[PDB]
Amino acid sequence: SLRVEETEVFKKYFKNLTDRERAVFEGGITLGALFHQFVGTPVSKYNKESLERAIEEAMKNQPCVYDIKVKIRNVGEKYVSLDGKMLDVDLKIKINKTVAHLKLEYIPEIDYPLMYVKKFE
Amino acid sequence: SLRVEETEVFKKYFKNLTDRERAVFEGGITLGALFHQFVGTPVSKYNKESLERAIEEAMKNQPCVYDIKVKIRNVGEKYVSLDGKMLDVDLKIKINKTVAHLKLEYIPEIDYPLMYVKKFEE
């Protein structure tokens, strides 16, 4: 693997963290990165699928990302600027034997695109 | 279609420009938009193609975009944040019978990712 997280120098900066702490830290980075990188992107039914695929594949690059699935909700025939409330993301981060499952989704009750941890394996 | 630029309300805001002025204005918006939307995006050989394709299809949504081709240069096995100097873009804007062909490419002599107009068809 040519991934930077495999290097000894990278690893030395995470000796103060548990594997669970590392997993959610890395998960947080990726969800925050995803949101801010892509919000604003013109999106319509025409490019929905290509956008979803590109976001998944782009973010897969980042440290410790094991798998990811991206859905864009409420996409219309007329294009709009992507907004955070339209994102529905499932993310898996793997740190050694620990897998964190994280979620980005719109929570109506707080009118907020919330990022959180679903569960650990 | 449902495209915003077809509405009479949209059109009334551009009665003060020539078709060449409009084409170049719209082309400028789209090149600025794509640079600033996508710079920063993680890119490797893994996602080079889906990223190129998604940029093309996203930008096609915008007013008056006739066609667009996006190439990301110097992509390796190891990922990097997309930077503007890696972009090589050919864009076509159509206003009535006027077509502006615009370019985004790296100019080594000024170390600059330059946006310009390649040619018109009128």
Place this chain on the structure above:
Amino acid sequence: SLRVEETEVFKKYFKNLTDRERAVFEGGITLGALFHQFVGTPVSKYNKESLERAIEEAMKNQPCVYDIKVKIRNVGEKYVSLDGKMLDVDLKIKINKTVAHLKLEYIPEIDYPLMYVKKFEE
């Protein structure tokens, strides 16, 4: 100055445009750039002014920007992600003796954050 648009290499890429065409092309670049760079940024009354000022100064770097004023509308005590429909921008582009005045503003009738040219000053 050290501004890239002052170099001969840069200039040689714009021989095919009138000054008005060049002004609106550069204006389109800056508006598209501003919109896509900053949409998404957390904004509340807390940081409204610093964001407005940072956007103005950042965009002043770009080729041929003469002046810019950025207002963010509908900012509350609670933060939101900056949305394009909240931007109200007046931009001046100067090419030799030509000044293009451009606008970004929300048009309720088409539910669209519209970029257009107000006027030229010659």
Place this chain on the structure above:
Amino acid sequence: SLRVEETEVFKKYFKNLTDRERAVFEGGITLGALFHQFVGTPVSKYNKESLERAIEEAMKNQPCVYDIKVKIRNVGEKYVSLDGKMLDVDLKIKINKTVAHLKLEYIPEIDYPLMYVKKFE
């Protein structure tokens, strides 16, 4: 406080995490968000100070951000697009009594803008 993270609904999504896990999760979001929001921004000596201040004030809005300091390195008279390797960020996240101190900085040895946790209190 009108902050969303103070609401009961928000809080119920984090019962599965320790305060340290929460702090690094929230810290990770803000650093990934900051990087991807601002990378690409035109920056020169002219607007360096206003850009740093705006980044600091913007990101302070986010859940659980206690304090933040943003420095942009190697800024010249001629503008460049902000590059992630130019960022030098110190970030404090507070969850109840737990404070996590996080860092974004360029690590020459792996040519990487690394995000990591410096320490907890």
